[PDB]
């Protein structure tokens, strides 16, 4: 529980409305809300944010550490946002952005016309590349995984929607 | 150079001894001399932790009882069959 | 070279030229069977070879015990 004790710093331009157990973050990139667990205590500071395993259940040290890094994920979300780069490796793969939907040509005999959730924007500077932009690490984490869910990389040449920071675990083709 | 904490046990017997070893303590006996023997009870945990050394069996063991500390030698160890504990030790008063 | 090891390839070494990496080795005749069918299966059809005779060298224990009918 080193991360349960470690306070979340709130730098300038960021507003934290500690209203009971539902906490709303607010900053440079909008505003998000998140309800916390009742095993977790909350106090602001002079400027930072310190949380505690509130009395009652004794497993709050396990709980507040989860409750800490969530807000530590949220405080960076409304200051910089986050972004997952992708690679659409494979000949015959493109993707374009029509406002909020993505038209993925994945070698299927039906167009993959996938629509994103709200609060995120996509960027396709290269047709085999996808730059998702959003606030939460959670919401863009799933979207990148749902994009991988259409064509997961096969371990022979890695044809798929692999991450640009992930190395694919290709094996030997080993036969004819 | 080992030291043993112990005391005199009373009301001995079969079930009496079985009542002891289910309470983290076990009996013993000290004999040898022109006197009467001494049925001495001593802590189980402490002496079992120190019986691993060879100096537990090659030294004048310094058992203290009611203030009076005596130097004895370890004759035999009647230990538990399959559990790693032990049941009884014979201390000849050397 | 690694697949040549499975074909008992007594290697010599690795040499290079202007666009090719030439490697000469000794291979048993018993494991010559369909070699270029397995060669260009591993080299994308861009390789070649030529078989020449050297000697009736030693047949090991597993290879000596096989053909005895």
């Amino acid at each position: 529980s080193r991360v349960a004790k470690a306070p979340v710093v709130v730098p300038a331009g960021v507003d934290v409305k500690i209203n009971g157990q539902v906490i709303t973050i607010k900053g440079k990139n909008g505003e998000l809300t998140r309800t916390l667990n009742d095993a977790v205590e909350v106090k602001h500071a002079d400027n930072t944010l310190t949380f505690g395993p509130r009395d009652g259940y004794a497993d709050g040290w396990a709980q507040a550490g989860t409750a800490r890094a969530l807000l530590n994920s949220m405080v960076i979300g409304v200051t910089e946002g986050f972004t997952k780069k992708l690679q659409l490796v494979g000949v015959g793969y493109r993707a374009a952005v029509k406002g909020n939907v993505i038209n993925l040509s994945l070698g299927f005999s039906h167009p993959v016309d996938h629509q994103l959730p709200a609060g995120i924007t996509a960027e396709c500077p290269t047709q085999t590349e996808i730059v998702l932009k959003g606030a939460d690490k959670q919401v863009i984490g799933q979207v990148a995984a749902d994009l991988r869910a259409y064509r997961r990389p096969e371990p022979y040449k890695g044809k798929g929607v692999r991450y640009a920071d992930e190395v694919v675990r290709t094996k030997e083709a080993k036969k004819k | 150079m080992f030291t043993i904490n112990a005391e005199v046990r009373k009301e001995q017997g079969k079930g009496a001894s079985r009542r002891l070893r289910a309470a983290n303590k076990f009996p013993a006996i000290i004999y040898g001399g022109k006197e009467a023997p001494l049925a001495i009870e001593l802590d189980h945990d402490k002496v079992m932790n120190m019986q691993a050394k060879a100096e537990f069996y090659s030294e004048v063991l310094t058992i203290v009882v009611d203030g009076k500390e005596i130097k004895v030698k370890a004759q035999d160890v009647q230990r538990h069959p399959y559990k790693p504990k032990l049941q009884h030790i014979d201390f000849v008063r050397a | 070279i690694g697949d040549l090891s499975r074909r008992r390839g007594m290697l010599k070494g690795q040499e290079s030229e202007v666009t090719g990496v030439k490697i000469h080795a000794e291979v048993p005749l018993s494991e010559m069977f369909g070699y270029a069918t397995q060669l260009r299966s591993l080299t994308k059809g861009r390789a070649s070879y030529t078989m020449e005779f050297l000697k009736y060298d030693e047949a090991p224990s597993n290879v000596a015990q096989a053909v005895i009918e």
């Binding site: - | 060879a54 069996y57 160890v77 230990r79 538990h80 069959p81 399959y82 | -």
Partner: protein, 136 residues
Amino acid sequence: MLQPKRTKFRKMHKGRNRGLAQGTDVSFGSFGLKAVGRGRLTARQIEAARRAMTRAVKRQGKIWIRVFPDKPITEKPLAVRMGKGKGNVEYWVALIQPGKVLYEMDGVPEELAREAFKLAAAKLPIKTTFVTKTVM
């Protein structure tokens, strides 16, 4: 497998298997396999247990077997009604009591001794433990 050469009788009464055991200390080598459960060991499991741990060290050190089958356990043949006489002896067992020193060995390093006994124990129907020779 181990079997008594020239015993007195052909069959023997069943008999309960109570009490404790006599072989308790690691009396010959340094590392033994004391038994914690209470059952019986036929000769086939006796032969198989040594075999697995003999090849665990492959030759190394002396290995002593402290249990020998004495009880001639019989079985009746199938489709035969009860009675009609005691059945013929099929296999020989050694009744195991709690705190019995089974297989014992010497001349091997400790860590592989516990390893070799671990390979042997899974062939046994009795829960055992790895015990070490103490002084006296």
